[PDB]
Amino acid sequence: EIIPVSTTLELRAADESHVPALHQLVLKNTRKHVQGNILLHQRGYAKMYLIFCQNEMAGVLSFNAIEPINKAAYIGYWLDESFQGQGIMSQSLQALMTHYARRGDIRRFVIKCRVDNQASNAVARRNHFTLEGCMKQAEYLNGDYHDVNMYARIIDAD
Amino acid sequence: EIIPVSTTLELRAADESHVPALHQLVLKNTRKHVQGNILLHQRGYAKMYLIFCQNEMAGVLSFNAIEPINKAAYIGYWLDESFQGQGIMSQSLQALMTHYARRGDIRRFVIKCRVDNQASNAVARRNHFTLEGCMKQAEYLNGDYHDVNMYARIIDAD
Structure with a gap:
């Protein structure tokens, strides 16, 4: 299952074949995971995609959980x-x-991220998500409980 | 496991012994459920309590899900x-x-309810929850996707 993103980027559904390489990146920055x-990916309960840039594994783009009935997904990601x-997450996410x-x-695509997470807040804003609340x-x-921004983007009928 | 609420109200952890009676109320307004x-209740992944008023079963008060690490619970309830x-949910929830x-x-106690759900919004407000977003x-x-208010109350240190 491949989701084209761009000339140099593409998302590939996480596969058993990726374990070896991702583990390397995990460690640098598993099989059971x-x-x-x-x-979950096969059941539509979550999605886990691997981001490849010019054929090199570069990070993970996930729907941490999905609410099938509400057709809602919460987004999670991390980059090497x-x-x-470099906008790799922004382009990959718009494509996804x-x-x-x-x-x-x-x-309904949702991003929940800590108020103090500078990187995730910027992805949310660059990809036209609306801040729904804190x-x-x-x-x-x-050791602390942090405030979290909830952002959402709806892409369906007018 | 009983959680006192008042002279006439109390919450009892849902037990196999309650199935017969609750099913009756479900039907009026299961075992597997x-x-x-x-x-989930024994694992702390959710909680399901039965509300009794003067010893008669009157409804259900639940923590639909719990995020153990964040010590957060989402509240769900229904009354015969x-x-x-009659404030039975309000008194039961403050006690819980x-x-x-x-x-x-x-x-962190959370109530997510449809904007148009007049009853749930009033419980949230009467029990001093803060509206965090929509x-x-x-x-x-x-057949429709409705907006949902997210309310929260924190009860821990100052």
Whole structure:
């Protein structure tokens, strides 16, 4: 399952064959994790895609969870250190969302990220997500509960 | 497991013994559903409590899901027709939240309800929840996707 993104970028559904290489990147920046995500991916309970840039694995773009009935997905992503700040996530995400709007099984795309997560907030804004609210102390990290921005983009009928 | 609420109200953790009676109320307004919720309840993945008023079963008060690490719970509830509009959910919920703040495993209590759900919005406001945002077209119901208010109350340290 490949989702074209651009001349140099493409998303590939996470496969058992990727485990070796991703683990390398995980470590640098698993099988059970991947096998587990593949099962959700086949059931439409989540999606796990690998981002390839000029054929090199560069990071992961996920729908952490999906609410089939509400046709809603929460987005999660991470990029290897040498592939950050280059719009690879922005172009990959717009392509992925367009592709699912065309499939039709997802219409509401959601990004929940810490208010202090400078990188995720910028992806949300560059990709025209609307800030719907701020969940107080919603995410525990490093001993504290941090506020989280909830962003959404709808792509379906007018 | 009983959580006192008041002179006449109390919450009882859903038990296999309740199936017969709840099913009656479900029908009026299951075992698999209950057995399934009991398992999540024992693991702290959700909670399902039965609301009793003067010893008669009157409805259900649930933590539809829990995020153990974030110590966050999403609230769900329903009352039999003859027990609505009487603050039974409001008193039961304040008691339940206080009880969990004392246990300490939950500090962020969340109510997501349709903007047009007059009853749930009033419970949220009467129980001092803060409206954190409005999720656009987030809940499918009767052929349409409806906007949903997200409310939260934190009960932990100052």
